[PDB]
């Protein structure tokens, strides 16, 4: 079977470079115009660049252009992109891609690579900033508020949250991070209460950062 | 800028249409339609090419046209396995070609379930260290498929915004969060700002004011 098997992204920082490579397997590579697609976190499909069979002609996507290069080597199988001065855009999942070749105009791709993933990340290890979300019942059923934990711009994942050091788990939602363009995480937590417990009861979130080496214990009170 | 919609259902056995237009212009044979479909966790998959061309193995199921100056997919007889994202590309102009947004398409299996929606203001705390986020938290939805509008006022805001793609809870049901980043003068200066949440044709809009 055909295989596009991608190496070289991961972690990068915006003054690095990375030097993607795919390996071709289970088709004469050398027959096919070859290409590099990408998936950024939660959007679209982006074309990046490709080459034709033999290398001395390639084209690039407009944003790329004098900050990419396309290569590949027909013995060895591989195709390489080298990915200099780089940008928040470039965080993204870097398909290798074949071409089918049915057309000599409009690119059609019929193969694709599981990717790999590129992080452009402004730190490499960052604890996060803790805000207390003040408690809101605007929202939630009659007798009860949310309040909660804004924790945000910590990298890598994860980061833990409990409330009030673990004695406080019903009611309690912590989102899946969203990762920003910075290339840092940020995620909520939030735990619904009764409102009549806001004058008595004490909220804390544990916030732990592990990779950081930070833990934050967040008091939330109401905003009077 | 090629179009999609942002999302689309189908029942089992159902016919659903998803198209593919440009902001500017029409579609037209010569934008040689392609289409891609990308199930979860999977990478793309080749349908059909030239508009209307099935590549090898795709199902039948599966049909490609051009319709009211827009590129059209037609799956008739949905099947489970067809819940994936579908992309369309068109080509414009040399070198290559471009992509529309892709359309999410939710084979439905459960009954549908309207989001709950939960608006922050930037903390006090927040404001002090120099900075201002809103945070939209949206929950218990089906399908797992929402678009979350920013505005300023009454007037949309783009920049800034930080919205995850939609996971699925313990209960089966979907949660997502949106982030609108500001500075403290923009929150202060403004009357409002408002996260709108649409799904399935329906909005849900909560407003906080400094
Ligand atoms: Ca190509």
């Known amino acids: 079977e055909v295989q596009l098997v991608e190496s070289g992204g991961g972690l990068v920082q915006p003054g690095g470079s990375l030097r993607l490579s795919c390996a071709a397997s289970?088709?004469?590579?050398?027959?096919?115009?070859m290409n590099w697609v990408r998936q950024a976190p939660g959007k679209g499909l982006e074309w990046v660049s490709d080459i034709n069979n033999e290398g001395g002609t390639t084209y690039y996507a407009d944003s790329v252009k004098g900050r990419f290069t396309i290569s590949r080597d027909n013995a060895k199988n591989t195709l390489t992109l080298q990915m200099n001065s780089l940008k928040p855009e470039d965080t993204a999942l870097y398909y290798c891609?074949?071409?089918?070749?049915?057309?000599?105009?409009?690119?059609?791709?019929?193969?694709w690579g599981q990717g790999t993933q590129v992080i452009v990340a402004s730190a490499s290890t960052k604890g996060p900033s803790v805000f207390p979300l003040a408690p809101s019942s605007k929202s939630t059923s009659g007798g009860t508020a949310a309040l909660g934990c804004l924790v945000k711009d910590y990298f890598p994942e994860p980061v833990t949250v409990s409330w009030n050091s673990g004695a406080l788990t019903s009611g309690v939602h912590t989102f899946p991070a969203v990762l920003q363009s910075s290339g840092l995480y940020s995620l909520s937590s939030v735990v619904t209460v009764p409102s009549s417990s806001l004058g008595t009861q004490t909220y804390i979130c544990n916030v732990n950062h592990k990779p950081s080496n930070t833990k934050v214990d967040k008091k939330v009170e109401p905003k009077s | 800028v090629v179009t999609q919609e942002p999302s689309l259902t189908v029942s089992p056995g159902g016919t659903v249409t998803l198209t593919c237009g440009l902001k500017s212009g029409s579609v037209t044979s010569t934008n040689f339609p392609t289409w891609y479909q990308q199930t979860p966790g999977q990478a793309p998959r080749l349908l059909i090419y030239?508009?209307?061309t099935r590549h090898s193995g795709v199902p039948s199921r599966f049909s490609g046209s051009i319709s009211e100056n827009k590129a059209a997919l037609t799956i008739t007889g949905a099947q489970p396995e067809d819940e994936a994202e579908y992309f369309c590309?068109?080509?414009?102009?040399?070198?290559?070609?471009?992509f529309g947004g892709g359309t999410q398409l939710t084979v439905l299996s459960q009954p549908k379930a309207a989001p709950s929606v939960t608006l922050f203001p930037p903390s006090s705390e927040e404001l002090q260290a120099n900075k201002a986020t809103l945070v939209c938290l949206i929950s218990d939805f089906y399908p797992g498929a929402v678009t979350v509008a920013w505005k300023a006022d009454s007037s949309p805001v783009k920049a800034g915004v930080e919205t995850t793609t939609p996971s699925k809870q313990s209960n089966n049901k979907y949660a997502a969060s949106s982030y609108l980043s500001l500075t403290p003068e923009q929150w202060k200066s403004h009357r409002s700002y408002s996260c709108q949440v649409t799904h399935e044709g329906s909005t849900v809009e909560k407003t906080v004011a400094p």
């Open positions: 289970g088709f004469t590579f050398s027959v096919y115009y």
């Open positions: 891609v074949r071409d089918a070749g049915y057309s000599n105009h409009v690119p059609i791709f019929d193969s």
């Open positions: 030239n508009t209307n």
């Open positions: 590309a068109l080509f414009i102009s040399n070198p290559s070609v471009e």
